[PDB]
Ligand binder design. Structure first.
Ligand SMILES: [Cu+2]
Ligand SMILES: [Cu+2]
Ligand SMILES: [Cu+2]
Ligand SMILES: [Cu+2]
Ligand SMILES: [Cu+2]
Ligand SMILES: [Cu+2]
Ligand SMILES: [Cu+2]
Ligand SMILES: [Cu+2]
Lengths: 462, 462
């Protein structure tokens, strides 16, 4: 028998000796939390004005005491930020936390290293920073998380992540669910461990090879259920876990279509029974509950553990069907002057590194001209047991050309900013930076990021 | 009636609104810890080798559960390291902590920014780093603490601090108590707050204007006594606190003579009843116990709170031959070309800043030519109440020329690397960097450091 998922079975997170299985919680089932859309300060056709505010607070997650949490414009996680292609965006960043944070727009194509908001973009307590940008990139699902170096892991654990939706005119024209909170919803998959008083303790739970709690947390909810009032729903999956891989699938083996990846819509829709997500990967999918009846409760699983209940209410019949081609993927041409960059991800545990060395934040590790496209060959040097390392790159949306010289997985024909690399595997990417600056590339298992599995590239203009 | 101590009374830490008084502990009284000397790996006359290991551990501090602590070559604080002027010193920095740290040699005249061991000298978990240097500076009492930016304050709270003794030919000639752990003892002065199961929690106790607990902790000991077995004892005081000021004095108003500041022997000895130490300051003092007979008991206080009981036993009579002059202070001439540098410390709480801007890792703030000495005028631009900021400079011992135009305090005529600037005060330093590199200057209230009250200077060879 085969494995359903596209990644190499022997390298799944669950064969590790440190593996923490998910347990179903005792807490009562409650409605999936849907983060409200962040009301702009001002909006016109050309200019939008937002205030994003890191803040500390408390949240009812489990019965008893409220869990102390951080979040953007709310106690935990963050109100969902909407950006438009071609719109000039003005964001006031404001830190009201006790510690200093960063504001990373993961997958956004903005100048580094201040707008991109990496290690080099501190915002001290009490401080406000004012950034501005125009996105010239396809409609997709981004996110915002903290990125101090270190500790990105600790801060993300505390609850500093938020969904970011980018819109364009092409996506608006397709026949997709788009009614936010009703048939189009964030599904931000995370795992935590609660201690005494339902409180989190990252340092108590720390493991240099990835932190993973046994209690799953969807949009900062425990045992969520979502009431389905339409035949088709669109889930925007985001893996905001520190290490855990998600092996999503319905109990029924109900199919669903993927229409979106990290960076863009997929070129063509892809049908699925099971779907794996490494860290930071996103997938937009359409589910058809047409076969189910009022009162039926349908469960989404990961491995053998239930995640999310779907309650089926009365819904009017939906006759529409998706086009054969969703999106037109326009691949740059490789600059024949530039050679093939070979990035080598090596090690696990405390010995992670990239191309022989650990992050130094004064040090430029590589260079590349803007506007010009280069082949990257990203390799995972891990050995017999190994692990799938999610490779991420700031300030770009790349294309996947090969996996060990074969075709990329069916959901990889779009633009991506994060790709899972299996042990032994060498993937070929087509990477082009549009704006100059300094960008990191690192494994997005956030413990390895902080373990220094992270280099930075400086882009210039010739 | 006057104030006994040299600093401005209205600006003492105890006038602060969020002041935490020390309270005497319930803990049983017990022998003061004396950190053992770190045994060299190998040692000739011209070369010494050392291994210093950041390691995590537990330490019986109170009866019950062991307090989880950090230390260098031990569970808490650190074994004392001995360096000798002229001797080429080799050190292997081993980090076995779960977080990344840094090995700052406070007051060492060593090249920056790697050896100096500041913000730009990270050492990751499980990683080793080798460094060499030859100290070319007077004998004095230095220390080692962590200096990752941020959080310096968290790591010093966990207990990463260690006394460092520098010896030379001149200091050996003089008649000073010099039998370590018997008549020459460290007195590392710190405070902590204990929570459930005798544990520390820095983030519970966090205050952006300075953390301070109610429990005094001398050399990682609670309610210490020390058995005196010699008429003269030498105390090397170090203020290892995050924020607290120590206002030291004995009962019986027993006098004591100061022979040593931060950077050197004092030119001449200075008698005292009451000494005030701001953060990171050191003071070697001699205490004569000739008045007292066997079975007597003298208590060292801070403000009105007993720190350390001295138990007098039988001792041999001792000469009282402290010379009139201990050390000759060779002051450089300021270079006529160079201007007066003006450093302005400003703020309290979350608004702390130096010269109108917070820290920025990859921003050089100032420059100075190696070997050439310049007047620095450091100002504490604080309001009516305000507080004393201990100003500190990596990579130099400086001299104090004036306080608001008047003479510096009696104990400030030697070399120093940390000085307390009172509100509305302008001290005038004479500063010279011997080796080139990048060095920071900051307040040594460790919370203000982390709040970005810190800049950095770059030294070059012309
Ligand atoms: Cu990210
Ligand atoms: Cu990113
Ligand atoms: Cu990794
Ligand atoms: Cu990143
Ligand atoms: Cu220091
Ligand atoms: Cu220092
Ligand atoms: Cu420092
Ligand atoms: Cu300060």
């Amino acid at each position: 028998n085969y494995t359903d998922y596209f990644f190499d079975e022997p390298a799944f997170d669950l064969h590790d000796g440190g593996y923490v299985p998910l347990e179903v919680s005792d807490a009562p089932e409650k409605p999936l939390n849907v983060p409200p859309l962040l009301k702009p300060d001002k909006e016109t056709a050309t200019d939008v004005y937002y205030t994003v505010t890191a803040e500390a607070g408390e949240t009812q997650l489990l019965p008893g005491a409220k869990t102390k949490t951080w979040g953007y414009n709310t106690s935990l996680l963050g109100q969902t930020i909407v950006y438009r292609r071609g719109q000039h965006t003005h964001v006031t960043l404001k830190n009201t936390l006790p510690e200093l944070t960063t504001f990373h727009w993961h997958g956004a194509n903005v100048s580094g290293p201040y707008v991109d908001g990496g290690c080099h973009a501190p915002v001290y307590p009490g401080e406000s920073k004012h950034i501005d940008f125009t996105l010239e990139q396809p409609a997709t699902t981004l996110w915002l998380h903290a990125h101090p170096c270190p500790s990105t892991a600790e801060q993300v654990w505390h609850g500093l992540a938020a969904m970011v939706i980018v819109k364009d005119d092409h996506e608006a024209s397709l026949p997709l669910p788009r009614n936010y909170g009703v048939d189009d919803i964030p599904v931000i998959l995370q795992d935590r461990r609660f201690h005494e008083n339902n409180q989190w303790d990252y340092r108590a739970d720390y493991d240099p090879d990835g932190v993973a709690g046994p209690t799953a947390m969807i949009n900062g909810t425990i045992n969520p259920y979502f009431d389905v009032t339409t035949q088709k729903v669109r889930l925007r999956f985001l893996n905001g876990a520190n290490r855990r891989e998600w092996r999503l699938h319905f109990a029924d083996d109900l199919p669903f279509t993927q229409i979106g990846g990290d960076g863009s819509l997929l070129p063509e829709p892809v049908k699925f029974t099971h779907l794996m997500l490494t860290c930071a990967e996103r997938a937009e999918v359409i589910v058809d509950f047409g076969q189910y009846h009022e009162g039926d409760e349908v469960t989404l699983y990961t491995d053998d553990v239930p995640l999310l209940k779907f309650r089926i209410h009365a819904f009017k019949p939906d006759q529409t069907t998706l086009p054969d081609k969703l999106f037109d993927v326009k691949a740059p041409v490789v600059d024949p002057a530039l050679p093939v960059r070979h990035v080598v991800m090596q090690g696990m545990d405390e010995g992670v590194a990239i191309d022989g060395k650990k992050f130094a934040m004064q040090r430029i590790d590589a260079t590349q001209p803007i506007g010009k496209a280069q082949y990257w060959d990203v390799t995972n040097s891990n050995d017999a047991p190994g692990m799938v390392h999610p490779f991420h790159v700031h300030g770009t949306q790349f294309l996947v050309l090969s996996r060990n010289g074969h075709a990329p997985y069916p959901n990889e024909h779009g633009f991506k900013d994060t790709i899972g690399v299996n042990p032994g595997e060498t993937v070929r990417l087509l990477v082009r930076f549009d704006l100059p600056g300094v960008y990191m590339y690192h494994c997005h298992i956030i413990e390895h990021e902080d373990g220094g599995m992270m280099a930075q590239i400086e882009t210039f203009d010739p």
